[PDB]
Write a protein that binds this DNA or RNA. Structure first.
Lengths: 161, 143, 261, 188
RNA sequence: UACCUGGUUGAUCCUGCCAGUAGUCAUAUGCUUGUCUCAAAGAUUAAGCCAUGCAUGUCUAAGUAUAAGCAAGUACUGUGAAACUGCGAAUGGCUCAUUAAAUCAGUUAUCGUUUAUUUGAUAGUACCUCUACUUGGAUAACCGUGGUAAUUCUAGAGCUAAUACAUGCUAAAAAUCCCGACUUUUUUGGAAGGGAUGUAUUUAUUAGAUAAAAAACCAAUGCCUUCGGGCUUUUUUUGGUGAGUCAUAAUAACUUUUCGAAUCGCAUGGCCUUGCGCCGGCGAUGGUUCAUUCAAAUUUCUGCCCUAUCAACUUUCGAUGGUAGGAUAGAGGCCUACCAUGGUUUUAACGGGUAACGGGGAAUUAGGGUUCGAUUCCGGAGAGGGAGCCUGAGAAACGGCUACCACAUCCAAGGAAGGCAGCAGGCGCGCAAAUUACCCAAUCCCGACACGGGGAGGUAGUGACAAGAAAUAA
RNA sequence: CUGGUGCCAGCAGCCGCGGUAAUUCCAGCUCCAAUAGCGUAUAUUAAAGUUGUUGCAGUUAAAAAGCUCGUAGUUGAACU
RNA sequence: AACCAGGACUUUUACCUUGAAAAAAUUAGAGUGUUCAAAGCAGGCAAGUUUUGCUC
RNA sequence: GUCGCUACUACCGAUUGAAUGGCUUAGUGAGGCCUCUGGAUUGGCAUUGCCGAG
RNA sequence: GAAGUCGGCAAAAUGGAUCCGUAACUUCGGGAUAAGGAUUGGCUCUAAGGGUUGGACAACCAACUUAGAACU
């Protein structure tokens, strides 16, 4: 039984869990279940523990300190990719991706370095979409005011006659 | 039934959305014609009661079925019981039989109702668990 | 019960669809749209059991999804689309146009209008009132809304549309000496002229209609559709033209046609 | 849940109705929200149709209207003066509709001074002509003038605090004000 | 298909009953049993209990992406697992336990309300009196990785996206109102420059005239002739229903100011300060309001077996009506506080039995009548029994969850936990009722969708029977 | 028609047969109604003019209350 | 005024006729050669070109 | 008709009658919902407590 | 919890008031307070039920009850 943050009593208790609560993924959206989870303060009943480290000791731990693991997945959003490498407005950011080798995928030759997709960009496609939206919006407004003028003239001649 | 003071409740009885001021003497009295040919009584036109549950000078509307019956029990405030008499046909004997059913309706102060007093009513939305009709026309036994 | 129903039943379908009692237990169940489910002909029924261009549900789905069938000037990809009275189903591939009108017995038959006379549609306005900003608007029988109508247009009037530029082209009032086609009841599909109008307070209104062959009948207002003026029908009526020949008339006619033809 | 159907009560003939079906969502009821005078607290309860209702648990600084000059101002609530439906609710100061309350009259006083111009209870030729061309209707009733001097204005609430989440209403005058004062004078 | 017969008596005519007689997808059973076509088939008792397997998933060129997946241009350019996301899951199918103006049937009303989807309209409005125009933080998936005998049990650690999440002018020109650089007739004075006036909620007020036609005045003040003051077809708003405090607009304020696309696909089309600059058609998916459609919810009138050895019933803790309030999407004694004692009833109220789901309908057939309807369609209730609730437009959902009771269940005895009146199949009760078969090809349904799924449905297999045609011969 | 038991075994829906000549008991034969169907049990319908509104019966077969008043209910002289 | 015509005219009905409105399946029943029939709602031309269709 | 005699039915029935399901009586009462608190942690503020989600 | 004792002797238990409910039997009058249940304090209020009296009313003076609610 995983121990749940918040329960001060150091014994397992069954509570109505929700979707936002951890240790439970509902099968259906809005489905609430009841499960038993432990408390917060550790005692003599728990079996495993998890620690978060901040500082390093005087001795060098070979399993943790001596071994470093880098990161694999880089930034994707426009703001994240700009701040990661500190690029100005005109800095050719589109050529700032990380090169990786995927040759052992049985490609054989041409060591393709596939790059992640970029969102929130300034591609001309979204400019074309934006001008299309503004174009149709202006056309609807022009049609509306023209129809208003035509009906005002029709009403004017109708009341005159 | 008996004309008493219109302020006989714990609250203040007033017609909704009817206003009084100084530039115009007090306010106006609001009334509506229920339609279907029934004429608004002159007492309702010039009266003093409120009767939010009244087809005239109120908010309920007449729509649906129009029925006619005879008063059997007028011993309730603004509400009376009417009796509908009809013949039910029994096909087996090719004859008829008397059948009656009591109907509860709400009555405006503009109508004075006693036993008899053939009343024509119209459906005006449920009022309290039994009353879906309001009296619109009265055929008095004395006049 | 406990939610809207999505399955219809063969036998529970409208009788005028003319669906076989056997060979299937479920009916098209028209989707929501311009026309009521009980007063509409599904596109699948029209293209399979009426025009016979398709034979199966897969076939009619392929036809509709090729973007070839167009209703009221717009292509419809819905299988059970509710195409009802006075709808212009335009097949631009072959080059044919159909106007959905009731038959002599009231059923939805097959009518073929030309390329011209297919770019307009008559709508019986359901209500006319002023909306936001005080602007006027009317709603029609097919769930269509039109802004800024003519002040002369009132309730129960028939207006003419375009289906490619919208706007009203002509309007017909509801009164005596107006061509009307019945769209409901025991006289649905019959064409005649208004003669007398009755009046009922809080109930339905009776309209008396005399056909071309001097026959008078009566019908409710909700079943009356104005299609034109006297001596000039603004639509191409199908064979029969709403005369309602009796069973004996149909029998001797059928005997007359039979033999050498 | 709280049932709202008529199937549980006895018939018009007095006979009780046997059970027919279980409780249904489309005929449910909810716990009354006895809102009180205090800092604002509004809850957004989901309602049938995907809409939302503003449940009010404490209200202050309502919107009240003065009909004599056709004005409306945001005035702070004080407490319930008299609730005709139940003396318990006014005693515990719960805000509903048609319940008389006390509001701050200072916004009304300053608006009256800025509009009419003349002082109550006592250069700029454009201001003089504006304030002198709208005279005549400057006289105001003494019965409510006393409450203006008292600093608290009697008002009646027309909105429903438990439904719209607002506290709106208008102040009383004329026979409407006189009847309520006459009824509440022996009570106090 | 308007029908008879035997039996009391020594014998006769009646009343009278018993028995014979004929029909019934009307059930079972004894005997017997070559075909073809066609239709039903664990309803009658135990709405008893269930091993097993399945029955609800879904992706187009067009929502999101470095799998450490695959056949093969140094943001991606193909395919493709899983995941996030949207929708459906409330349809379908089964059963008839409960149920006596209750369900249901025909017929009305919602001017007493809600509604995701489909359809048509609807939207230059916010902000500055210095605002990034392409915006902020996590996360699934992914890489490591632990506990538990087990579950569709998952924490801890590192990252990354949205049509999920939380904010925000993209649009000008330009009118009126508030503040006021400045304030006398310059008719009754209003304006430089500063903001708002889009839209939505709530409150109060007002206009909302029109079957017409002739007058006497008072305050704001529109065209101003020729200041005597005239003073108009008209600015005066405008529309519909049988009827509205309806629509609509305005006035004075309020709002944890709801909405006002930070979105994608296919076609490289035109030019001159030549920056790689403006620019172009056809679609898709969101989103505000109204109407429409598909539905739900109440609701008007009439019609429901037997029983009086059930004659009075309801009024506390709501029964009848009124006032006010709360709650509901909305009407309402639905609930609350107060006020009066009311409401039904020999035209059968109330109570009881039902071996009672109701109807279209079925059987018998001169007419009239009698019996049945568990069952291919419509409506209602239910998922062992009640009760409560989240999501969702729509559930008091049970192939969703929570609690209790009766069953049954693995158990390291700490614990997890489940519902075939769904399709086959099993035990038992039984007089009584079939394969643990095949398929989405036809009908239609769902979904992001021309392609996926559907024990809905279709196809087949066993039976003594429900129906129609004739072989055993010449 | 023939053999076996003989108010017994048994039939037998009812009458009824069976105490040595058993057309009704059990065995052979023939025929009869139906035919891949026949029979049996139960529930219902017609019969039942034995539920009668059409359409029963009440002196003696079942049934006119001991008599009278009289309310609901039913029926109600002729004429415009 | 009324004299002519047009809109409403039941005080309020029962009763009769007719009409509107209102599920399909079912029943009666129209038409049509599942070889007849229970069925089903299909179908038919044309016997010399095998007819880029027509007709209920 | 009586007792004599046999199988069977129903009623009453002491036994202060028992037991299955409903209607109530008084207490207790799980769980969800609303509501008042509540504050592991987050959260804009070396810097501080304030809106807070919780 | 009557196992004591011939025997519930003695003692204990119940007890006022208000609101529900109350059987067999009966001479119809009773049984009956049958049996069996709930409440009761203090404080702050609310509503109703009566007397003379200044110009539809009315500021006093002089009064006791009943019922209900919140809080503690």
């Amino acid at each position: 039984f995983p121990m749940f943050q918040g329960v001060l009593l150091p014994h397992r208790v069954r509570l109505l869990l929700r979707a936002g609560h951890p240790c439970y993924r509902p099968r259906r959206d809005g489905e609430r279940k009841r499960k038993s989870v432990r408390g917060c303060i550790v005692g003599q009943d728990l079996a495993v523990l998890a620690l978060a480290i901040v500082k390093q000791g005087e001795q060098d731990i070979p399993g943790l300190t001596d071994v470093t693991v880098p990161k694999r997945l880089g930034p994707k959003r426009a703001s994240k990719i700009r701040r990661f490498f500190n690029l100005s407005k005109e800095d050719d950011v589109r050529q700032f991706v990380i090169r990786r080798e995927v040759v052992p995928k049985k490609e054989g030759k041409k060591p393709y370095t596939k790059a992640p997709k970029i969102q929130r960009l300034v591609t001309p496609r979204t400019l074309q979409h934006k001008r299309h939206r503004f174009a149709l919006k202006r056309r609807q407004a022009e049609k509306n005011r023209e129809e208003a003028a035509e009906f005002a003239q029709l009403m004017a001649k109708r009341v005159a006659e | 039934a008996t004309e008493l003071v219109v302020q006989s409740e714990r609250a203040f009885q007033k017609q909704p959305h009817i206003f009084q001021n100084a530039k115009k003497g007090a306010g106006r009295r609001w009334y509506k014609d229920v339609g279907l040919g029934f004429k608004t009584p002159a007492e309702a036109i010039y009266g003093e009661y409120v009767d939010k549950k009244c087809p005239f000078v109120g908010q309920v509307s007449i729509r649906g079925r129009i029925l006619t019956g005879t008063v059997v029990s007028t011993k309730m405030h603004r509400t009376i019981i009417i009796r509908r008499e009809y013949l039910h046909f029994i096909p087996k004997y090719n004859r008829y039989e008397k059948r009656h059913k009591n109907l509860a309706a709400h009555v405006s102060p503009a109508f004075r109702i006693n036993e008899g007093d053939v009343v024509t009513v119209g459906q005006c939305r449920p009022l309290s668990k039994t009353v879906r009709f309001n009296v619109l026309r009265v055929v008095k036994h004395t006049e | 019960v406990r939610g809207p129903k999505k399955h219809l039943k063969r036998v529970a379908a409208p009788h005028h669809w003319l669906l076989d009692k056997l060979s299937g237990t479920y009916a098209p169940k028209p989707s929501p749209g311009p026309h009521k489910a009980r007063e509409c002909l599904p596109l699948i029924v029209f293209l399979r059991n009426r025009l016979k261009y398709a034979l199966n549900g897969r076939e009619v789905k392929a036809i509709l999804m090729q973007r070839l069938i167009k209703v009221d000037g717009k292509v419809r990809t819905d299988s059970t689309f509710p195409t009802g009275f006075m709808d212009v189903i335009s097949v631009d591939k072959t080059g044919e146009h159909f106007r959905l009108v009731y038959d002599i017995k009231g059923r939805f038959t097959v009518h073929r209008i030309t390329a011209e006379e297919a770019k307009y549609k008559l709508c019986k306005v359901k209500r006319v009132q002023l909306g936001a900003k005080g602007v006027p608007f009317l709603v029609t029988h097919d769930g269509r809304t039109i802004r800024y109508p003519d002040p002369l247009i009132k309730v129960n009037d028939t207006i003419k549309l375009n289906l490619e530029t919208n706007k009203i082209e002509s309007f017909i009032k509801f009164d005596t000496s107006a061509q009307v086609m019945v769209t409901g009841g025991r006289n649905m599909g019959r064409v005649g002229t208004i003669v007398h109008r009755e009046h009922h307070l809080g109930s339905f209104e009776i309209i008396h209609v005399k056909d071309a062959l001097d026959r008078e009948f009566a019908t409710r207002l909700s079943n009356v559709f104005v299609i034109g003026e006297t001596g000039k029908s603004w639509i191409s009526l199908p064979k029969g033209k709403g005369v309602k020949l009796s069973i004996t008339e149909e029998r001797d006619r059928r005997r007359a046609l039979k033999g050498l033809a | 849940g709280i049932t709202r159907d008529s199937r549980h009560k006895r018939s018009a003939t007095g006979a009780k109705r046997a059970q027919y079906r279980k409780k249904r969502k489309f005929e449910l009821g909810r716990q009354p929200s006895n809102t009180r005078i205090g800092p604002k607290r509004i809850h957004e309860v989901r309602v049938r149709g995907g809409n939302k209702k503003f449940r009010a648990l404490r209200l202050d600084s309502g919107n009240f209207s003065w009909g004599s000059e056709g004005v409306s101002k945001k005035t702070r609530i004080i407490q319930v003066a008299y609730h005709p439906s139940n003396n318990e609710l006014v005693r515990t100061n719960t805000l509903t509709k048609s319940a008389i309350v006390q509001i701050d009259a200072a916004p009304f006083r300053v608006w009256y001074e800025t509009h009419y111009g003349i002082l109550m209870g006592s250069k700029s030729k454009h201001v003089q002509r504006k304030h002198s061309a709208r005279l005549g209707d400057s006289k105001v009733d003494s019965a409510l003038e006393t409450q203006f001097a008292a600093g608290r204005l009697y008002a009646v609430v027309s909105s429903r605090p438990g439904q719209s989440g607002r506290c709106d209403g208008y102040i009383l005058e004329g026979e409407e004000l006189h009847f309520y004062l006459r009824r509440m004078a022996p009570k106090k």
